[PDB]
Amino acid sequence: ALDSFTLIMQTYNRTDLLLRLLNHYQAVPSLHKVIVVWNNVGEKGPEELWNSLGPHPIPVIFKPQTANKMRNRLQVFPEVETNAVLMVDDDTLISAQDLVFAFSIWQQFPDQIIGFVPRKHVSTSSGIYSYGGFELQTPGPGNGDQYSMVLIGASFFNSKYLELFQKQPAAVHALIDETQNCDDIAMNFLVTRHTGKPSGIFVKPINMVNLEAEHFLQRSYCINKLVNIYDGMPLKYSNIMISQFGFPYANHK
Template sequence: MSTLVAIRDAALNSGGDYSPAKEKAATRGVFNGRSPLLHRRIKLLLGGFKFKLLICFAFLSIVVWFSSKIGPFMEWNPHPDSSVFSPSRGGFTVLINTWKRNSLLKQSVAHYASCRGADAIHVVWSESDPPSNQLRSYLNDIVLKKSQTAHKPNFKFDLNEEDNLNNRFKPRPDLRTDAIFSVDDDVIVPCRTLEFAFSMWQSAPFTMVGFVPRMHWLDQKTNGMTQYKYGGWWSVWWMGTYSMVLSKAAFFHRKYLELYTNEMPRSIHDYVTKERNCEDIAMSLLVANATNTSPIWVKGKIYEIGASGISSLNGHSVKRNKCLNDFVALYGSMPLVPTNVKAVDARNEWLW
């Protein structure tokens, strides 16, 4: 029973005369002198369904926005949705290239061991001295400790006495997966992002799928010869076009290890050995030449945990330009295929 009805009934039952004036006077006492019309309007506004719906929508928007901002920082030791990976879909081998950076190697191995899709972790070791027993024991233990699955990743060192960037693409006869995830020891890709990229690779297993896009741009023609310019990240960001994904963080089929080592022109091997650079460009050219298709760039936040690499050194762009043009000359044509396509995980996007 409402307050107004209770007041009115009390007046009638007491035998007194009822009038609107008396009711208005009584109402003033109940609402401390406030206008009942104003109170009713406020009450209707606050209790209205539309207003409640608006409040809920605003609250959910804030939660989604905040989650998207902190999400990448919470995925260092993630627990991916089981729907992303299942044993029936297979896994991938993480191929980590390292050189005299054991502290970074430990972080990298620990992280990738926690990713459910990792069937094996191979460390490409290119030092004259083999890894110490202490380092071997530590990394084996950390793989067992960090793994999130009953099937623990197989861990091993691929030993090479010579310091040569071609070592990272040597064939591995004991691989159990077709998928290879090639990564530098100072690059961390969150597990959920990595699993999404793996699903993209499964849809196109003979192309390269990765996180670091680059582009070749037509520079000039001299004496009938076409010259190209190597385009870094900013040119890709500005133009939205790329033709390579670098092997510092990329998936490719294991058959390309065989092709790189035994089928690619020996002159390119020698070039990489001498210059200590551009093995990633060579791999991109190899895959493009074999498939005549574009790579796939996966949008995703990656973390570089070490100091600046060779890309920050003076003259790096000049060397990359020279590599690109020299390799194209050896191929006799430009095999790279530009594209504007980018793979995006819609679960991480607010607008799509």
């Protein structure tokens, strides 16, 4: 359980992908256990099929959920024995090389969200914010760009943030259920408020693949709602992009 991480994968109507990803993730080094947050209410889980195809390198725990809520993966599962949690959406395949490297980065910054997907907030009207990525102008600073959030759907973060998440104002939880979105924005708000540092650090992935409209609109909406509830914009910008020295070979020159 020491120097190991736990994979928390929430799944919904993607069982075929889930099983394929599981076949990949079970073999990643330093993986201690897998927790599948089964959000398909009233549907039999593929655990029988999974075991019939055993043995497997680590225990995979299927936890049936009473409702299909985005926040289910953020609960404090008793089965999690590690200090770090690896949270990945059930449609994303991240290479073992990216995971091993990112995990080693997390161990050096255990209080920050270490991930592969950076995003930001911008403002063009006092007190009004917008959610976006590199298609939006850099917020403030000089050259280059900035990110103020690292999405939890492809990251490593301290398991203690799951508990701290549960302890956030009811207005925050209310907001999450309301939109069935923005849980990662909430997590980023929560982390930076706890540390006083940028909520996360962006590690550029070498091999991460996705296997496959009011969504983005809700994103901006949530940032503004959260600013009201917390009575302030706590997110901090960063332009730190970490890559692995020598991987690929000679990438330093």
